[PDB]
Amino acid sequence: NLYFQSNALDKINRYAHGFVAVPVICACSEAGVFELLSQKKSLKLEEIVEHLAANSGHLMVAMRLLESLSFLYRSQAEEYILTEQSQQHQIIPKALMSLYKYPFELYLKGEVETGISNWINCSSRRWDTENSLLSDLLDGVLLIPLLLELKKQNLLDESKKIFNTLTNSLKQELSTLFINLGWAELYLTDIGRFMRDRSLNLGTTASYAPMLLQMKELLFGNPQRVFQRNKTEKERHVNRTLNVVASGFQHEKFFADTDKIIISIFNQQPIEEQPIYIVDMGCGDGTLLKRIYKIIKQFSARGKVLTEYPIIMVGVDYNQEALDVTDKNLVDIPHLVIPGDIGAPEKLLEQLKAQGIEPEKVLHIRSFLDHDRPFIAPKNTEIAQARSQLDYQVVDVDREGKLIPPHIAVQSLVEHLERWSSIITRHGLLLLEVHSLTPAVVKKYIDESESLHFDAYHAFSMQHLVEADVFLMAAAEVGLFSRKEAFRKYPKTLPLTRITVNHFEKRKYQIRYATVNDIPNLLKCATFNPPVNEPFFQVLLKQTPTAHLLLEYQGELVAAIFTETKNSNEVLGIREFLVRTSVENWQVLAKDLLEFVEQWGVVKPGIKEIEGLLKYHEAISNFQKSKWYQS
């Protein structure tokens, strides 16, 4: 915990930002996006799409990135307007895009005709701008592939004398760069060691270089040429090898967060009623399954009695090579590997039954896969219709590169979780997932959070991130609730959620957003505040369409909690509490709703604090004494 680390952390994150942002800015500049918004200053996305013959989905990804960088702003009519910062697009050299295919391997080996001296000189001048952020964005285009190769060839871990075995010209090139950057003084400095030790965190972003090189095709050409799939069906938009290595390394601290959940499950008495099978959908190399088994064996009551009550780990994956690797990795662990697909839980269930596996004895688990499912369009058009008036900000791009409407992306996730919800047992569903943020929050935490680059390259590659609150809502709509004692989120202390660790349990009821359509039923409920009239409900529902929660059981309204969002959208407050005391177990259910509102508010983008929990907990906990109206 040293003083220099806070600036170093900002720098490395900014480098990853620039790795994605510079291709977006350059492609937009070349196609005339900034010029168009200078000739006509207020344009909606559809107008920009039409006039530049753009692909609406990828273009939305680019616009959200530019908004997050404060290059553009959106009016209340959803019209894009340039800012003074957007003139920075003129400072970017467009030859800089050549680095995305420059052979850094050959360069470090002296087998290259043309080196990188021009860019080293550019960096020393801070790219001819005083905007510190901007010069860090451009630095990232160069430094990310270079640092990764310097680490890969073991040119930085070398004791003391780094660059000592390189040709003298190479020595001076990299010595100048490292000295100019404060990385070396020839010995590495504090920041120099920091950048080297943390290089693999850039691997996932760096692996999308082939896609980012083709940004102009994504935005303005034929997106499918970027995503080939030839005969061997190797991915062309990403170096999956480096990607899988890097993401596995990053997924490490999150796997450890399943320890407390696993320890809790397999300490639960009696042993015979615990799960027998732990089934990981998308097992990859089996790292998570292997860890879980060792945790059970060493740290749980179940681990003392495996002789009498064995555990069986089950790896499921739609790729046979993954099953083979997982099979080998789970040597000496009782296990099974079977094919399956994240989108087909019904087929998984039938394959388990074909093995004689008793479905009710299964704990289902998975990590970081729901957002990478094959997108299935909504079949429930009526629920999709209702959903369409809500203000979701999910960005999701289809195979043609067109924008999937946010409410359609959400309804797809709901229906996909419903298919899973129908097979989840009383042992529940251990689920880790990564989430996108809104541009308002990304803009506010640009130096502290990875979202700017991570959300962009995810949406560009046709993955389906949602914001963390949207995910928890989609689960709640189908009766899956993330258990309070198991939950973890990252980042821990910033008002934004990029990662959730969940133990979902299946409950008999559902929680969804209240809508204007619910107002007649809401008017009839018992209510802690004096009875609310329709206009105030309309006011609340109009101002924050996705901030009021209701709990339903067998089509019957049980309870509802309305909220207010205030103070630069940093404070969420409980505003109304409604119940129907005619429904069996309504008080327990209403307490569950208030607990859910707290969890949901904890992951709501931008929310720093929740007000009113004590007041409204007391209201429902001492119901008769609190003297509710219309009871």
Ligand SMILES: C[S@@+](CC[C@H](N)C(=O)[O-])C[C@H]1O[C@@H](n2cnc3c(N)ncnc32)[C@H](O)[C@@H]1O
């Ligand atoms: C998401 S990445 C690896 C991360 C891994 N899912 C985990 O558990 O952390 C892809 C891995 O999941 C598998 N996978 C990708 N799409 C899948 C799908 N639709 N159904 C089942 N497995 C899938 C891949 O074959 C690969 O093994």
Ligand SMILES: [Mn+2]
């Ligand atoms: Mn992903």
